[model samples]
Target: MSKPVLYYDDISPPVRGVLLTVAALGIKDQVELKLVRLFEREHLLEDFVKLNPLHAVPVLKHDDLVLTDSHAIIMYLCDIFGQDGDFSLKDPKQRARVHNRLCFNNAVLFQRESIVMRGLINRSIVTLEDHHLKPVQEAYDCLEVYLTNSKFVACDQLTVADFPIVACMSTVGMVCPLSTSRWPKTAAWFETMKQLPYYQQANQVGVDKLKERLHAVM
Candidate 1:
């Protein structure tokens, strides 16, 4: 079978989340990365739209299967390519914890980031107001509680949950920086994630691009 093809945009946190998973799975070189320039409206084109009716980034096409949504794609990748005892997907409770964190990251954390990014895209959030920063900080507070007792986001070990949170925080921090003193665990956890061997390669370029765009608007 042909290698999986990932339709991605570096400026997108979710796409970078998938990139982190691909690297963690040790399949970075095995997957084909295709850039979908959203600024150019390439995702609306018929070919890409067929792959994702939502016209979003981070679409994964493997053999005949097409998967959308970053969390789902990463878990599926782990199921297919990862060895035993990896990604914390084996045990029922551990898997449940991972899923829980993923849902939190998606529903709460990432959605907050999206609000700010949406404002940035429209040039309406030239300066962040309390209305903008409040929810983002609340999300950070919740994440801090999650990390208060655990080393990783979902559990004691690194799971798929950490990737997207790290990616989202990387961008969210641009608007409202994480307070190391206030969120010691989450801050420390962020530093630890940076030390991952593939962290820079998989995540930094997209983050840098996003930083530039966000700064330009701010």
Candidate 2:
């Protein structure tokens, strides 16, 4: 009867994505979120790295099992906790669509947002280079195309897929401000996502911190 715990940091979009999923599943009360201090380098410490070799956030510890990576954690949660929920589509085709969107978000949206917005431009952990920005913009353009005819990122239902994609992109949009004039559908969808209750809760901390970081950088 041990409660599941989510290890995360406040400023991380991936971690917030997991939090959004937990909230959507109505299991926020069941999951104990252990907030690690990323700025203090808690994630790099020895004890923390044992749970995740890559030292990433959003690690899920359920009893004896430890799951890392946001994508894997979302799938595991869908298989386990999503049976009674609508967070993931049940239809085979719909499920495939959802998985495809999830893959795109992870492989595309995640790379650009993480590398450009978080790593190079904002954090200065890496040098700002056109090569990095080029791929990021490419990913953004691809996302805009997919969103042109879609309501959500996957299927017709709201799923765990939306959490990571929306959370990450929105974080980037706040800083870089995507051109909605050319991507009206994507822009409208983002507007709708901003109104979700779960999105509000999950992003509150990160948004505030981002503003603070912006002030410092300015």
Candidate 3:
């Protein structure tokens, strides 16, 4: 089978989320990471834009099927590649919980953090106000409660849901460090995610760059 091509810019947490899921499943050349030069407006060109009108990175093109959303890309990779791996759940209820968490990350965690950070840079807002932190911290509050049940976000075992949340954390932590005392489970889970194999290539590389980029802009 031809390896699916992944249109990506490493600076995006959503893109990196899919990157880690592919890496965690032991890549096996099932996907190719093709850089879309966000810095150069490559994704805005005709070809790539057609794949994702949003002009965003992290589009997964597997043959005729195109997946623009990172959440969809990650889940599809797990369903196909993680069938026998620990990253995907088998039980219906447990899997549903995983689904819930993925949506949470997609809707809340990434949205709250990414938009705020991107907004700050885009709008050239140099000094951050206390009001800027309200939404980001509230999202952290949500994660604190979500982690009460297990080491990971959805289940006692690490699932696909965990990957997306971890990706969200790499960016959100830069905004507000998870309070170890206030949200101990969330803090601990993040440390655990840091120690996972292949995380450097999967999550850290791009996130560190994004940190630098955001700081430079601010």
Candidate 4:
């Protein structure tokens, strides 16, 4: 059988999260990686939009099935490929905990950070705007507390949840100076995740390139 195709853009954290999860699940070989340039509006094209109306990257095309959302994709992978892998929590309670963390990361951390970073990248922020900083700081504070009590964002084991949370936070750390001293546990967790093999692969594109691309648009 032909491998499933993963449509992704490495520069985007959300897409990179999917790539990282594929690697973590040890099913990297079973998938074909197809790079979709977000800056070029490849995802927004009619062909791609037909597959995912959301116009999002990290679309997984498995035969006739097309999965759009990252959360849905991760759940599908867990059900199929991650059963034998030690990536997800086995216990129901622990799995629920992981899911909760994942939701918080999406609704809070990713949401807030995206606003600040997007404004910066798009050059829309006139100054250190309170509107941006307030939510960003709040999200960071929540992460600091969560990381202090847990090793991973989700379960005791690294699961699909860790991908989006870590990728988004790591990207934020790369662009903006986040003081590790203030959030020691979260900082340590970020450091550890950075060392993972798949991380390097996922972030092969340098930040300078992303900046240049955004500059052209902004």
Candidate number of the best TM-score: 1
Find the candidate with the highest lDDT and give its number: 1
Which 10-residue window of candidate 4 scores lowest in summed lDDT? 202-211
lDDT of 3 by residue, 38-149 (tens): 8788989999888888999789998899999998888778777777877765567876888899899999888888767777668655667767777878887788888886
lDDT of 2 at 112: 74
Q: Order of all candidates by lDDT, from best down to worst?
A: 1, 3, 2, 4
Cα misplacement distance, residue 208 of candidate 3 (Å): 1.3
Off by over 4 Å in 3: none
TM-score of each: 0.95, 0.89, 0.94, 0.88
Against the correct fold, how does model 4 do in TM-score?
0.88
lDDT by residue for model 4 over 61-136, one digit each (tens)?
8988899866667767776787666865566876688678778866787777778777776678746645657776
lDDT against the true structure, each candidate: 0.87, 0.76, 0.82, 0.74
Each candidate structure's count of clashing pairs: 0, 0, 0, 0
Candidate 1 per-residue C-alpha lDDT over 44-89 given as tens digits, one digit per residue, 9 for 90 to 100 = 9999988899999989898889998998888888777874747748
Residue range 1-218, candidate 2, lDDT tens digits: 57778998857788878888888888888788887878788999898899889898989999889988887777777777786677655668776787798888778888778876656335665445567567766777877777765667775556788888887876776646667776677777778878888777787668678667756665
> Candidate 1 — number of clashing residue pairs?
0
RMSD values, in order shown = 1.3, 2.3, 1.4, 2.3
Q: Arrange candidates by TM-score, descending.
A: 1, 3, 2, 4
lDDT of 1 at 11: 84
